[PDB]
Design a protein around this ligand. Structure first.
Ligand SMILES: OC[C@H]1O[C@H](O[C@@H]2[C@@H](O)[C@@H](O[C@@H]3[C@@H](O)[C@@H](O[C@@H]4[C@@H](O)[C@@H](O)O[C@H](CO)[C@H]4O)O[C@H](CO)[C@H]3O)O[C@H](CO)[C@H]2O)[C@H](O)[C@@H](O)[C@@H]1O
Ligand SMILES: OC[C@H]1O[C@H](O[C@@H]2[C@@H](O)[C@@H](O[C@@H]3[C@@H](O)[C@@H](O[C@@H]4[C@@H](O)[C@@H](O)O[C@H](CO)[C@H]4O)O[C@H](CO)[C@H]3O)O[C@H](CO)[C@H]2O)[C@H](O)[C@@H](O)[C@@H]1O
Ligand SMILES: OC[C@H]1O[C@H](O[C@@H]2[C@@H](O)[C@@H](O[C@@H]3[C@@H](O)[C@@H](O[C@@H]4[C@@H](O)[C@H](O)O[C@H](CO)[C@H]4O)O[C@H](CO)[C@H]3O)O[C@H](CO)[C@H]2O)[C@H](O)[C@@H](O)[C@@H]1O
Ligand SMILES: OC[C@H]1O[C@H](O[C@@H]2[C@@H](O)[C@@H](O[C@@H]3[C@@H](O)[C@@H](O)O[C@H](CO)[C@H]3O)O[C@H](CO)[C@H]2O)[C@H](O)[C@@H](O)[C@@H]1O
Ligand SMILES: OC[C@H]1O[C@H](O[C@@H]2[C@@H](O)[C@@H](O[C@@H]3[C@@H](O)[C@@H](O)O[C@H](CO)[C@H]3O)O[C@H](CO)[C@H]2O)[C@H](O)[C@@H](O)[C@@H]1O
Ligand SMILES: OC[C@H]1O[C@H](O[C@@H]2[C@@H](O)[C@@H](O[C@@H]3[C@@H](O)[C@@H](O)O[C@H](CO)[C@H]3O)O[C@H](CO)[C@H]2O)[C@H](O)[C@@H](O)[C@@H]1O
Ligand SMILES: OC[C@H]1O[C@H](O[C@@H]2[C@@H](O)[C@@H](O[C@@H]3[C@@H](O)[C@@H](O)O[C@H](CO)[C@H]3O)O[C@H](CO)[C@H]2O)[C@H](O)[C@@H](O)[C@@H]1O
Ligand SMILES: OC[C@H]1O[C@H](O[C@@H]2[C@@H](O)[C@@H](O)O[C@H](CO)[C@H]2O)[C@H](O)[C@@H](O)[C@@H]1O
Ligand code: NA
Ligand code: NA
Lengths: 397, 397, 397, 399, 12
């Protein structure tokens, strides 16, 4: 079979993409180690058939792969006929991601969608790994599935309480015990913060951009899907902020908040995971940092939406992942405060109390400053709008 | 044999029950005409054998009956020795419900569990009526069953698909077709709404709390199991909200949502069903009402589970079942909406468009009001969490 | 706010702690609302540097904080240079508790230790709040202190006579009246009982597990230090009994005596204290109980140590703190004796006469029992060793 | 990991339904006398008296200052019994009678290699030291079941698959287990004998000098723990405890009621001491002799026995075995029927074996012409039998 | 002397 890493791509926000915009995304996906984009599309978008076409063409031109994620918040069980005709077009397309000789197909929800009639009407074999909510259902589904994709990327206990971290693998283990002789696609997400009038909460992630990958080496799922490449609206994008996507409102908390440096962390772990290593290998000294724009208690001045649910469980911290070939001393300035920790060789995340004002990072070995600089955003104690996304940046020696 | 009515009881949530807690539920089931509780227990609960012991003791003390429902979401075929030793304890307990001289036993799922080894190891005869997902396997079952219990209590196309109502008997007929001479335990459920990470949907029930009982008089299955007595998490409880049960998170949408009044509908139909009568007998003038707490299109922005699947197929209605000895006039006030219908004698369900605000109900005969009052709960257009449970109430002359 | 609660942690008994042991302790403190551990360490322990390093790392990993408590029962004024190099290691570690931007440092005694030389050699600012015996020295110390920590956690009148309680705030006033521009760290301690051949006495505490938090909301000090997290030797631990710690001989009176339930009282008072409320808020219905294992006059059978000084001033009582949302009746069975008392909503402590034998508690409201059970420990009228520690337990709804 | 070594003994809870606490006390006092630290309480989920007897056994332990731990017999317990396993551990992990290995509650199994201890440990407050019985050495080395060690059941000569090979016993399997138990704990098995005669199991392993040989191996190997198989498994003939009044006959009374094995504890005791003290030789206290032998030649034909002869018996020897425990060298003389043997024996603990003769058995130890101990075998060797019995009779004499 | 930073339940 081999191991593969996919990334969740929001087709709904790229109405105006060209083939070239797609190729730029997949090129940056390729150089992270990602094998394929899950193209998350909706029945209600007039641009779905066009943009699926562009994505598969782009995949073919840059030798990336793609598979379709039928987003069943929009698709319905009564859409079988359409879904079949789409699979007929793309299951045997050269750009279609193939898992064990079959066209991978997944979904967002759609636990009840029967893939049997789709599979029977398409010549080319299909490998159906829908997103399922219940591990028990994943182990006994009657819908002709070949594995399950868990959306449990963040700490949760089973209810609609926001719970503290850190992330545990409890839900992965429940899924895995039910999927014995089937495939498990584990989710990997750095972050979660959403601020729409139809959804306004955070999950408690913190060191999640690093720790989740550590869990992937322990657990070795058959597949990984990164949530997400470009879902700006829920703040878990690790892809670039593309000029051509259509803003859904999330520009407010994503436009000046690059997340690209998180691909610096994912890259060594994607390689280790595909190689079956238990520990990543650091090739050069780098540093990744992330922090929210304000302390969590800063009441904003203008926001037509309330503060997000769950923010009292966040910590006011600056997070720093160092990827070093030899041990060193990490020094962090956060506003008026300064901290220092010795940090070992390898990939290591530390958290520092967040202070209002300038952020500065330095890594020294013997007496040599090996890398360092100012964080790209000042922490503030005022805000117009509740922004619980994070700014991410990096230094590379 | 005779006909009996049973009710699904969650042992999993009564860890702290005393024998008296059981006896209270048992008395309320006895007043409804219920013959036995299905004790739905799991192997993974330390307290299963304790609460099974109290249950059987309580049954004998109040001349009530119980039988075990092994929940095979938790039990497995590896548990045969334990299941056999439990059957050896209780198959001839004085509280054990006996169906034509055999101890009734059932399950949740566990279609492939073989009762042969269990029956050949227990002296007392056992009557195995497991929950089977496949009507056809109910006819060719190699597992030494004496009947099948259907869990198709709600409108569905299979795979837990949600479809518009009303409830039909399509699945019941497949079971009775394939069972031939074996026993059929038909499910009766008033509602379905659940709001957890692993399950977040509604079935489209609506007038189901009445319409299913009418379907039972027409159908006359050998047995009936009410889903359920106390499954708060799925909103189909007809028993009281008990103070001793353990909250699984469902108190959020059930603490203030009594469903006791639905027993007013159940009681005369249970009697007609055991009598084999084709129509219920109304002894006194009564009215049962139910409705959801909000219009279906309300947005609950902080609820991290998001809205349940299926809600677009619901209607915003107030539902009213009248139990009338004589024709009369029903008037309902729903917010600013105003309705009046001539209701015939007997048991009749009417539904009316939902209006936000206070609800009011009145039955008049010869221009004299014979029962009425204000709905226990005001319908509202704002909400913290999605709740698609119903408030149920009644009025009696 | 700018108000924090700390707990006194015995570094001397955790030579074999791992970082993970420390994390478990800190997580349980974090759950209680405690902000930092006072790392009470000795110059003579070979493992002080290691275990200091562990604790600070663990604070970093679970985003807790720690500060060093130099135990001047062991440290001497001649240790200035070693204390300085330790403060240079940790004053700017992220795990280090910062108070108004300065590294908090404290001590056990050491009244005469001069902090000026330490402040002068350490670049990071330092906030020194040593334990001072004399309130007047707190008012006029020449040792460059920024506040004072009182050890007056129990009833005492200035001399070495043991006195009856209850606790008063007499010593708290004396300190505050000497610290009206510096910081007062007030002690909070639930109990006191020690039984070594170098210290063998009780203080008279009784209702102190609750009374002292009440005094804190009135006496609103700048900081609180809880005595203690894990000093089993003096029976004032509120932390778990950790198997990783090294028994000094106190296991004889602490192995079978959990104190964890006192954290149920602390948590609402810690919340109120930080939020400046003068009354705590009760979340759900709970009960905490505690009692000594024998009537105080029981002469025991093989104790190589005499009866502790002061035990004749104790009361043979069972103490119950009810945390309640509405009023209720509390009934207490102690041996062959049964008592009841009506109990208001809120947090209320009642004492009950001790009877030898088993102990039972139940809280009733509207006839229903809402919480109750048996105490984990039967009161005995014989014993091998003098044990004036208490057994603590709880019940929750 | 514990600075000290310990010896435990496998105890069948399944045969002691009618035990009282006092019956337990009696067994534990004789185990204490031997230097054994704890009983492994081998119990089954399907016994209605498991909780009654575990309770009695923990109380007895605390009352006589002995220790116990639970051996979950996974021929009956199943991986789906985590909840009950977990709750029994919460009852007993901190019981006064619970054996603690370096502060954690010891827990063991028979088989159950895939049972996951993680969920138990995580749900039990008091720490737990998981040393299950594992059949594969290689799997002891990278098990995913949260184990702190492995307990080997390779107590007898075998090529695996319960194959029967000639002895003498070697440590080939202990090495495999120790090689894969790098940092973790190895609990090695010590068994004197093996003969079982049931429908489901009817064979012998070739043990012979095993009741002594295996202890000598333990002083060279110094495993972190030892479990003696067994205290009272009468059914497999490896019991070293008394034949108790109160146990329930499972059918083994036929070959065990008149076959005391207590004298084997005389060999056990000094070797338990050298093992715990990390010493390479035992210390002999007084001159003693321990003898054992089967009741009949191995070619005896028992036509009435529907089980037929046990598998393996062709590799046995018709021998009488004698272990001498001498403070100074002496001469061993043995009479077996009309056979007559004498051999010089060094000081220390030495086993000799002599061809078996039908009839009266006799033993004598003399030093420079002077009798120091000896007497008649407790059982005449017979050449005709009703049922195949390949258990041994065991006796002793003391100077 | 070097630590693993933020880490999963297990190191130590
Ligand atoms: O009104 C703006 C926008 O509307 C149309 O475009 C929609 C497009 O914005 C986008 O909306 C998605 C949502 O569907 C939703 O996606 C969730 C996602 O957040 C997460 O839960 O994962 C699941 C599966 O991936 C998704 O269902 O929320 C995100 C923000 O967090 C929204 O951006 O996609 C939908 C459907 O594809 C589009 O209809 C309209 O075409 C466009 O012109 C306009 O800009
Ligand atoms: O032999 C036992 C133990 O000795 C060494 O470890 C010592 C360790 O037990 C512990 O001893 C403390 C005492 O120092 C003393 O602490 C008091 C405390 O009770 C209270 O008065 O407050 C002040 C400040 O907190 C402390 O001074 O008494 C407690 C019991 O109440 C003892 O546990 O810490 C000391 C010093 O750090 C250790 O030296 C030895 O290293 C260790 O291996 C051995 O187990
Ligand atoms: O999570 C907190 C809770 O966990 C443990 O108790 C469990 C208890 O909550 C309950 O769990 C139930 C689920 O098994 C499941 O029940 C299904 C029914 O919804 C439905 O009718 O269909 C089938 C068959 O009837 C059931 O499997 O979901 C419900 C909620 O809808 C949920 O209540 O029972 C289990 C197993 O018996 C308990 O283990 C824990 O023991 C408890 O202390 C804690 O409060
Ligand atoms: O398994 C749950 C489904 O049960 C019913 O669907 C049945 C089909 O799965 C199919 O099952 C056959 C089965 O009964 C058995 O006898 O062996 C056959 C060969 O392996 C199976 O193909 O056909 C049955 C007859 O049409 C169906 O009854 C429910 O209809 C479905 O909703 C459930 O998901
Ligand atoms: O029907 C509501 C219950 O759904 C979940 O339990 C499922 C079982 O009911 C059963 O689901 C059947 C399914 O296999 C399919 O083929 O069609 C039937 C009709 O829709 C379904 O009833 O089997 C599933 C797999 O084991 C179960 O997940 C919930 O767990 C349960 O609580 C609900 O009451
Ligand atoms: O070896 C004496 C025991 O045999 C039977 O129990 C077996 C287990 O001990 C174990 O057998 C191992 C087997 O898997 C093979 O791989 O070789 C090993 C060395 O010979 C064996 O020890 O597992 C078997 C399968 O579950 C068991 O049947 C008897 O039941 C037991 O009483 C004997 O003590
Ligand atoms: O055969 C009648 C007895 O059966 C039940 O007791 C069992 C015990 O005999 C005991 O069985 C051992 C068995 O598990 C295996 O290890 O072989 C041994 C012989 O070498 C057997 O002694 O343990 C079982 C499980 O713990 C018991 O279930 C009845 O309970 C008992 O009353 C009868 O005497
Ligand atoms: O409440 C209805 C749906 O709202 C949420 O999803 C929204 C999506 O449908 C679309 O309108 O975009 C917004 C954000 O731009 C999304 O929040 C729910 O999470 C979804 O499941 C509901 O069907
Ligand atoms: Na059929
Ligand atoms: Na055994």
């Amino acid at each position: 079979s081999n191991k593969y890493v996919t990334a969740h791509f929001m087709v709904g926000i790229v109405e105006n993409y060209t083939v070239d915009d797609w190729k730029h995304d997949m090129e940056l996906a390729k150089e992270t180690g990602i094998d394929a984009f899950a193209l998350n599309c909706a029945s209600i978008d007039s641009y779905t058939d066009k943009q699926l076409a562009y994505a598969y063409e782009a995949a073919e031109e840059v030798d990336f792969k793609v598979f379709i994620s039928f987003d069943f918040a929009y698709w319905s069980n009564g859409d079988t006929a359409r879904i079949t005709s789409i699979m007929q077009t793309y299951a045997d397309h050269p750009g279609q991601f193939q898992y064990n000789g079959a066209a991978l197909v997944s979904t967002f929800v759609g636990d009840s969608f029967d893939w049997g009639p789709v599979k029977r009407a398409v010549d080319h074999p299909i490998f159906a790994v829908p997103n399922l909510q219940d591990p028990n259902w994943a182990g006994h589904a009657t819908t002709s599935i070949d594995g399950a994709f868990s959306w449990y990327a963040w700490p949760t206990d089973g209810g609609n309480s926001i719970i503290k971290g850190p992330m545990t693998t409890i839900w992965d283990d429940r899924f895995r015990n039910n999927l014995k002789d089937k495939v498990y696609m584990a989710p990997v997400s750095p972050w979660f913060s959403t601020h729409f009038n139809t959804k306004n909460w955070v999950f408690i992630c913190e060191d999640l951009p690093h720790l989740r990958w550590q869990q992937m080496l322990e657990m070795q799922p058959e597949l990984i899907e990164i949530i997400s490449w470009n879902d700006y609206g829920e703040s878990h994008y690790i892809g670039p902020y593309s000029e051509a996507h259509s803003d859904d409102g999330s520009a407010q908390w994503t436009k000046d908040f690059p997340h690209d440096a998180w691909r610096i962390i994912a890259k060594p772990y994607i390689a280790a995971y595909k190689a079956g290593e238990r520990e990543p290998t650091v090739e050069s000294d780098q540093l990744v940092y992330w922090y929210r724009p304000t302390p969590k208690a800063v009441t904003c001045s203008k926001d037509p939406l309330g503060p997000p649910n769950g923010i009292n469980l966040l910590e006011d911290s600056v997070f720093v992942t160092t990827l070093l070939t030899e041990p060193a001393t990490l020094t962090v300035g956060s506003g008026s405060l300064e901290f220092s920790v010795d940090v070992d060789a390898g990939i290591v995340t530390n958290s520092f109390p967040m202070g209002v004002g300038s952020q500065a990072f330095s890594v020294t070995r013997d007496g040599e400053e090996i890398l360092g600089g100012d964080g790209g955003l000042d922490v503030q104690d005022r805000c117009d709008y509740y922004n619980f996304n994070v700014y991410v940046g990096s230094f590379s020696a």
